[PDB]
Amino acid sequence: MNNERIYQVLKGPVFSEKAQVLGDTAGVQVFKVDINATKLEIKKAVEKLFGVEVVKVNTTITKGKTKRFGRTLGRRSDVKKAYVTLKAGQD
Amino acid sequence: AKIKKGDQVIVIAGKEKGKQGTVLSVSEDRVKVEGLNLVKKHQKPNRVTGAEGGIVTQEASLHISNVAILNATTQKADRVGYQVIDGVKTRVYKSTGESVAVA
Amino acid sequence: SKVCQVTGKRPVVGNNVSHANNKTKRRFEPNLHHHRFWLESEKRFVRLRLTTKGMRIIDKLGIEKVVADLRAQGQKI
Amino acid sequence: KTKDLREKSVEELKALLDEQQLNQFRLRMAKATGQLGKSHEVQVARKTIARIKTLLTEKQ
Amino acid sequence: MKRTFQPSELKRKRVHGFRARMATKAGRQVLARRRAKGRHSLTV
RNA sequence: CUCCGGGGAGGCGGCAAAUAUCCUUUGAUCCGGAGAUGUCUGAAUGGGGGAACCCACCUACUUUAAGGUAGGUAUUGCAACAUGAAUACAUAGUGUUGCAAGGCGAACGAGGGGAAGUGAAACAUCUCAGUACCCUUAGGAAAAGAAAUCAAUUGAGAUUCCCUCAGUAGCGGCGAGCGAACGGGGAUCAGCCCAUUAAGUUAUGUGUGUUUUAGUGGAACGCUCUGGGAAGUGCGAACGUAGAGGGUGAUAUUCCCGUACACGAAAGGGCACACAUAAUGAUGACGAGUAGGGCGAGGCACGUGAAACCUUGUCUGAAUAUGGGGGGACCAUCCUCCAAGGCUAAAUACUCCUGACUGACCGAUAGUGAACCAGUACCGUGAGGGAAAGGCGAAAAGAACCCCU
RNA sequence: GAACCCACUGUCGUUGAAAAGCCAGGGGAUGACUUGUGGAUAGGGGUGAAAGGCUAAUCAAGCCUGGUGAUAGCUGGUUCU
RNA sequence: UGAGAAGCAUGCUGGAGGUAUCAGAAGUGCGAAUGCUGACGUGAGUAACGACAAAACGGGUGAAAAACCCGUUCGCCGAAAGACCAAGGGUUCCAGUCCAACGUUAAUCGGGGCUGGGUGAGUCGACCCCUAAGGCGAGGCCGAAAGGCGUAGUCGAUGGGA
What is the full DSSP assignment across A54-65?
A: EEEEEEEEEPPP
Residue A24: Cβ within 10 Å count: 9
A2, A5, A7, A32: which to substitute to probe chain D, counting the most D Cβ within 10 Å? Answer: A7
Local structure of D32: helix, strand or coil: helix
CB of E43 closer than 8 Å to CB of E35:
no
User: Could you tell me the CA-to-CA distances from A78 to A6, A34, A61 in Å, in that order?
Assistant: 20, 10, 7
Q: Taking CA C14 as the corner, what is the angle to CA C10 and CA C18, rounded to the nearest 5 degrees? A: 145
D19, D24, D29, D33: which to substitute to probe chain A, counting the most A Cβ within 10 Å? Answer: D29
Q: How far apart are CA D16 and CA B17, in angstroms?
A: 61
Q: Is the Cβ atom of E12 within 7 Å of strand G at any atom?
A: no
Residue D7 has φ and ψ, to the nearest 5°, of -65, -25
Question: What single letter denotes the amino acid at residue B64?
Answer: I
Local structure of A70: helix, strand or coil: coil
What is the full DSSP assignment across chain C?
A: ----TTT----EEEEEE-TT--EEEEEE---EEEEEEEETTTTEEEEEEEEHHHHHHHHHH-HHHHHHHHHHTT---
Q: Which residues contact C8 (CB under 8 A, 6 or more apart)?
A: none
Q: Of B21, B18, B41, B42, which Cα lies nearest the Cα of B31?
A: B21
Put simply, the answer to whether D33 touches A13 (Cβ < 8 Å) is yes
- Checking each nucleotide's C1' against the CA of B66, the nearest proves to be F255
- A12's enclosing H/E stretch is strand A10-13
> How many angstroms separate the first and last alpha carbons of chain C?
16
User: Could you tell me the CA-to-CA distances from B44 to B50, B57, C18 in Å, in that order?
Assistant: 11, 14, 99
Range of the domain at C25: 1-77
Q: How far apart are CA D10 and CA C28, in angstroms?
A: 79
Q: Taking CA D23 as the corner, what is the angle to CA D20 and CA D29, rounded to the nearest 5 degrees? A: 145
Q: How far apart are CA A32 and CA A82, in angstroms?
A: 6
> How many angstroms separate the first and last alpha carbons of chain B?
17
What residue in A sits closest to D23 (Cα-Cα)? Answer: A7
Q: Is the Cβ atom of E41 within 7 Å of strand G at any atom?
A: no
Q: Find the length of chain D.
A: 60
How many domains in chain C?
1
Q: Which residues contact C22 (CB under 8 A, 6 or more apart)?
A: none
Contact residues, chain A, for D21 at CB < 8 Å: 3-4, 7
Q: List beta partners, residue C51.
A: C32
Put simply, the answer to whether D21 touches A49 (Cβ < 8 Å) is no
Cα distance from D38 to chain A (closest Cα, Å)? 18
Q: Of C45, B62, D25, D1, which Cα lies nearest the Cα of A3?
A: D25
- A86's enclosing H/E stretch is strand A79-86
Experiment type: cryo-EM
Q: Of B19, B2, B1, which Cα lies nearest the Cα of B10?
A: B19
Q: How far apart are CA A80 and CA A61, in angstroms?
A: 4
- Checking each nucleotide's C1' against the CA of A66, the nearest proves to be H91
Residue A70: Cβ within 10 Å count: 6
CB of A4 closer than 8 Å to CB of D21:
yes
B contact chains, 3+ CB pairs < 8 A: none
Q: Taking CA E20 as the corner, what is the angle to CA E14 and CA E25, rounded to the nearest 5 degrees? A: 155
Q: Which residues contact D37 (CB under 8 A, 6 or more apart)?
A: none
CB of C30 closer than 8 Å to CB of C1:
no
Q: List beta partners, residue C71.
A: none
Q: Of A78, A45, A53, A84, which Cα lies nearest the Cα of A64?
A: A78
- D55's enclosing H/E stretch is helix D40-59
- Å: C76 CA to F286 C1': 32
Interface of D with A in 1-60 (CB under 8 A): 18, 21-22, 24-25, 28-29, 32-33
CB contact burial B72-95 (16+ within 10 A = b; e otherwise): eeeeebbeeeeeeeeeeeebbbee
What is the CB-side half-sphere exposure of residue A65 using CA atoms within 13 A? 3
CB of B16 closer than 8 Å to CB of B61:
no
Q: Is the Cβ atom of E33 within 7 Å of strand G at any atom?
A: no
| Resolution expressed in Å | 2.4
Put simply, the answer to whether D24 touches A4 (Cβ < 8 Å) is no
Residue C16: Cβ within 10 Å count: 9
C and A adjacent (3 or more CB pairs under 8 angstroms): no
D17, D19, D21: which to substitute to probe chain A, counting the most A Cβ within 10 Å? Answer: D21
CB of B92 closer than 8 Å to CB of B83:
yes
What is the full DSSP assignment across chain B?
A: ----TT-EEEE-SSTTTT-EEEEEEEETTEEEETT-SEEEEEEPPBTTTB---EEEEEE--EEGGGEEEEETTTTEEE-EEEEEETTEEEEEETTT-PBP---
E and D adjacent (3 or more CB pairs under 8 angstroms): no
Q: Where along chain E do its domains lie? A: 1-44
Cα distance from A18 to chain D (closest Cα, Å)? 17
CB of A54 closer than 8 Å to CB of A36:
no
Q: How far apart are CA E9 and CA E26, in angstroms?
A: 23
CB contact burial B33-49 (16+ within 10 A = b; e otherwise): beebbeeeeeeeeeeee
Q: How far apart are CA C29 and CA C24, in angstroms?
A: 16
Q: How far apart are CA D28 and CA D22, in angstroms?
A: 10
Strands C44-51 and C12-17: unpaired
Query: B16: exposed, middle or buried (C-beta count within 10 Å: 0-12, 13-18, 19+)?
Result: middle
CB of A22 closer than 8 Å to CB of A31:
no
E and A adjacent (3 or more CB pairs under 8 angstroms): no
* Region of B99 on the Ramachandran plot (φ > 0 left; ψ -120 to 50 alpha; else beta): beta
